[PDB]
Write an enzyme that holds these catalytic residues in place. Structure first.
Site, short mmCIF file in Angstrom:
data_model
loop_
_atom_site.label_atom_id
_atom_site.label_comp_id
_atom_site.label_asym_id
_atom_site.label_seq_id
_atom_site.Cartn_x
_atom_site.Cartn_y
_atom_site.Cartn_z
N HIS A 103 0.83 -1.20 0.00
CA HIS A 103 0.00 0.00 0.00
C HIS A 103 0.87 1.26 0.00
O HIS A 103 0.63 2.19 -0.77
CB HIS A 103 -0.93 -0.03 1.22
CG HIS A 103 -1.87 1.12 1.31
ND1 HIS A 103 -3.00 1.22 0.53
CD2 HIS A 103 -1.87 2.22 2.11
CE1 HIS A 103 -3.65 2.33 0.83
NE2 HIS A 103 -2.98 2.95 1.79
N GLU A 104 1.89 1.28 0.86
CA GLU A 104 2.81 2.42 0.90
C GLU A 104 3.69 2.47 -0.33
O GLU A 104 3.93 3.55 -0.88
CB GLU A 104 3.67 2.34 2.16
CG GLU A 104 2.91 2.48 3.46
CD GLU A 104 1.93 3.65 3.43
OE1 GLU A 104 2.36 4.77 3.08
OE2 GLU A 104 0.74 3.43 3.76
N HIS A 125 1.97 4.09 -3.08
CA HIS A 125 1.87 5.53 -2.92
C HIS A 125 3.07 6.24 -3.52
O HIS A 125 2.95 7.34 -4.09
CB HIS A 125 1.72 5.89 -1.44
CG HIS A 125 0.31 5.88 -0.95
ND1 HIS A 125 -0.68 6.67 -1.49
CD2 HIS A 125 -0.28 5.17 0.05
CE1 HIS A 125 -1.82 6.45 -0.85
NE2 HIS A 125 -1.60 5.55 0.08
N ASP A 180 -4.73 0.91 -3.08
CA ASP A 180 -5.18 -0.47 -2.95
C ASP A 180 -5.12 -1.18 -4.30
O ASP A 180 -4.62 -2.30 -4.40
CB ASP A 180 -6.59 -0.51 -2.36
CG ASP A 180 -6.63 -0.03 -0.92
OD1 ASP A 180 -5.56 0.06 -0.29
OD2 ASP A 180 -7.74 0.28 -0.43
N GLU A 213 -6.38 6.67 -2.24
CA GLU A 213 -6.35 5.46 -1.42
C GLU A 213 -6.92 4.26 -2.15
O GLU A 213 -6.48 3.13 -1.93
CB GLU A 213 -7.10 5.70 -0.11
CG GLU A 213 -6.41 6.67 0.83
CD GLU A 213 -5.13 6.12 1.42
OE1 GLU A 213 -4.10 6.82 1.35
OE2 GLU A 213 -5.16 4.99 1.94
ZN LIG Z 1 -2.98 5.10 1.60
#
Ligand SMILES: [Zn+2]
Ligand SMILES: [Zn+2]
Ligand SMILES: [Zn+2]
Lengths: 410, 406, 415
Positions: A91-92, A95, A134, A130
């Site tokens: 997830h990070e 990003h 995902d 977000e």
């Molecule tokens: Zn996030």
């Protein structure tokens, strides 16, 4: 990408000086060997990646320029399996590869932002970023050989604790989770194939050491968790035995810790987790020779950083600072960003009363912590104790030149 | 005859290689024997070839046995202030062999192995032999001339013996006899004395690279050497670069050696350490090209092993083998060549050649049964009737004859 | 004023040069280069500033100047200069760039760190002038060049010697990038040179010795003192031949063959015991083989020891290598005050104060070396240490703290 590799360095240097970072070799090696395993399966990677662990019982995770992903040690208390912990890292990771925070600011400045990242580590994205974090996260999480249903399971267990506890976890402020976000996460993991993955032996050992050695607040390794692990699979049972040996060491009960660790080191004499703990127990009882001979008989001595720093410290407490220095000079040359090596080196050069070399080693620790002015001050003292035109003057003065560039930049 | 004693000498040498802590360094062994060799040629009562061995031991001692095989402990370098004093020990020890004193002593009375176990106990840092008052009264005064025709200090022996007395080990195997050493040295002549350039660097590499216990290269000596003649100042700079490399201070090592290599680009000592610094920083290509431009590349064994090793680290095992295949047939008794050749043949996946090279290493270290085992394995991987099978089986035959003698 | 502002920038750039460029700080070569350069300035028109000439250890040929009459010359000029008038023509060219204020005009009409970063790149192993700038500099240069008693034809002879090298060589001389040389410029240089009367002037004996020391002692790359040149100089005029023996003795001493350098130096030492050049070489041969005392006695008996900075530095160092640190301090405390910009004096002062175990004086002498090199924060660091080892209220504390204040006010003027 040119600047953001550099602003990454400035921001992680600030993190070292102020945030309570876990600098443990075994834990740092695990979080980065795991994290790099997902980066190799990630797309559009522009930068190297480094993963940092803060001693903080508040569950959170975030990332910034230069592939620097910040993880609170609380993630180990929430993560039942390794795939859940890597689910947050992917997830990070996504990003960064999507450069979400990059574009939040392209639409005075750097210090106001840096106080934000720092305040989060010491004890937000809109949902369009977000959902995409995902989106790309689980493809990476599945091509990394992990359980794709671990993300909906982990996201859901944040929600179950945000209604059955007073105020929600901090991770849900930077990474908000409405029911739409869950329903999407829950569906796409449904859409790919089932995977039966056993969590690696290193995950359970890393959880035990995180909650055992770096305990703080709600980050405890409790008898309930160790008794439950005594019933689990073959990998959880060794980690609970390691956890009992770890805590018997913490409580100064060295002889019980030796007997508790004995069946695991006898089964795996070359495992670095058990070698590390066996050195702590021997050093606790003033038997450095035993701790030295054991690590010299380790297969991976000259290739594993954990063993290198372990035997350097054993040489230090054993009264052989020169042997420590021989390891630590090579260690700091190959691992120049490791603050443990520079610190042990400063201890070694201090034991030999090489004053200029001691100050030079201290300076790297301060430079790694964002104290560049103080690093320059130490190197200036070192340079003032050696003849002009010496190789040590030129070296100390050149190092001062390089740190002044980093300060002239910000 | 000389034949049994040369073969008895080879057997004792093999046992030493397997158990005693020998210094196998190319530069040090090349110097230890080069100085011995032209010292040997100044005695005329020599029946045998001569080989000189260096043992990593901080307890001072020196001894010799059958086949012209002499043993020198590394502690000798901290006791030797100049080249002649070091050769004084060797001149005394070679004179024991040429006059056949130790063979004489054992003709008076399980025995060969009992003497070998004693020879290891003296050599190994972890029972001894002793000579009579005449025997070394022979050796010293017969050895002072052997030292004078080689152009070294005759007074170098006496000053070494007095430096042994006030500290009361060499003294168990070796005032009356000492008073005769000063008695006999003063009579002959006084001599100009100048250590070779290689003596000062050899002493630097022994004490710096093979430091152990009392065998340290101290900060007092190299500060002193920086104030000496220009040979000792270059040696002091070499020793500081060497200790920086030992401490893995790689950048400091390169900058310390840089002025020496710029002044003497063909010097084997500096060319050697420049390879260690280059490989230590994963710069194998730079070390290879430097060694290909060395003048004495295909004539100097030290440079050949250095380039062969650099080819291995550089990912060129074939080029390493081309050197080492020729090196091992020119230096059959050099275990370094056989070990490097085994590493190259392993990297090329020539398994039977690897087992054959490993076998020679075990044969030189006295483990003949193991060498026979590895050659047996190599011969089983090669077609019956092939030339390789005939060689492997022939070498087994040669090794079996060796073990059947003892 | 604008003279003051430009001399303030000049000092800032000179400090940056000292901190990154490889300057030759040799007492004899620095003295010669500045004595020759001042000789040209004294015959130049419209001089508003003091002048200082700097020598880079660089085998690439180049010469340039900036604010405050600071001229910087690459040591490769000695390789190209067959005679002193040729070398003087290049300097006269640079002084004329300064008197015309060519660089000042360009920046005035249309950055301080941008210009200073170029000046360091040109000196370390870009600024360019228009063809009128080069035309002004050659004429004004050749006029000051012959009023100084040098051969005017040396300027076109050197320019054409530069143009010939640029055509055949892979890459042009870097000096021709800062100072472009079309055939039009060379033909104009030939015209004004030919307009005056012929002048065959002998190069100074100081020139031939400087070229010998520059190429022999500070050799680098293409800057070698070849055996061909000296065998060539052994056959030359009265001044060239002893310059031959001097350079021969130099590298005999450079190669640590001091006994060979003695026998080569003998006749020139015995013939000329009162000139600084062989006195300087006659100190290095003595200290190299631990004969410090007669190197002191020889320099103690020198006439111009209280006039010549070269003998003072040589004798101060001899006292240091001779084990008499205080005698060195006595000389250097006065030399540093009369030669505030000579970093050799500050370094030797620090070495003497170190040997006398006067730590704060040592740190203070080190600081002036660091201030001269533009490392003001570092010089302030050393003075702060010095101020911390003397009692507050003392004469030394007030001095060290006042010096910190000066360096801090010097620092803010550009930061
Ligand atoms: Zn996030
Ligand atoms: Zn004897
Ligand atoms: Zn110009």
């Amino acid at each position: 990408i040119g600047q953001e590799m550099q602003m990454g360095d400035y921001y992680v240097r600030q993190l070292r000086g102020s945030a309570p970072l876990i600098n443990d070799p075994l834990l740092t090696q695990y979080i980065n060997s795991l994290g790099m395993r997902l980066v190799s399966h990630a797309n559009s990677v522009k930068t190297p990646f480094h993963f940092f662990l803060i001693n903080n019982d508040e569950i959170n995770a975030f990332a910034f320029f230069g592939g620097n992903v910040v993880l609170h040690s609380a993630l180990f208390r929430y993560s039942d399996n390794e795939s859940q912990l890597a689910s947050v890292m992917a997830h990070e990771i996504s990003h960064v590869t999507q450069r979400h925070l990059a574009r939040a600011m392209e639409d005075t400045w750097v210090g106001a932002l840096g106080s934000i990242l720092l305040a989060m580590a010491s004890p937000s994205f809109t949902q369009q970023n977000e959902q995409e974090a995902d989106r790309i996260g689980i493809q990476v999480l599945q091509r990394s050989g992990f359980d794709p249903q671990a993300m909906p399971t982990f996201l859901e267990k944040l929600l179950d604790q945000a209604r059955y506890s007073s105020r929600p976890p901090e991770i849900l402020l930077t990474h908000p989770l409405p029911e739409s976000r869950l329903a999407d996460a829950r569906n796409r993991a449904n859409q790919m194939r089932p995977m039966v993955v056993q969590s690696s032996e290193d995950f359970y050992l890393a959880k035990a050491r995180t909650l055992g050695m770096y305990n703080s607040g709600r980050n405890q390794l409790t008898s309930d968790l160790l008794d439950e692990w005594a019933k689990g699979n073959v990998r959880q049972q060794r980690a609970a035995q390691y956890g009992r040996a770890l805590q018997a060491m913490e409580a100064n009960k060295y002889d019980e810790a030796r007997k508790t660790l004995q069946p695991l080191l006898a089964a795996e004499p070359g495992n670095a987790w058990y070698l590390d703990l066996a050195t702590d127990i021997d050093l606790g009882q003033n038997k450095a020779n035993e701790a030295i001979n054991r690590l010299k008989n380790a297969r991976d001595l000259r290739t594993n950083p954990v063993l290198q720093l372990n035997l350097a410290n054993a040489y230090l407490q054993g009264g052989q600072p020169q042997e420590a220095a021989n390891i630590l000079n090579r260690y700091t040359f190959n691992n120049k960003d490791d603050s443990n090596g520079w610190d042990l080196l400063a201890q070694a050069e201090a034991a030999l009363n090489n004053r200029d070399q001691e100050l030079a080693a201290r300076a790297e620790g301060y430079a790694l912590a964002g104290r560049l002015d103080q690093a320059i001050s130490l190197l200036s003292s070192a340079s003032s104790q050696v003849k002009l035109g010496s190789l040590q003057q030129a070296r100390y003065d050149a190092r001062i030149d390089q740190l002044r560039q980093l300060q002239e930049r910000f």
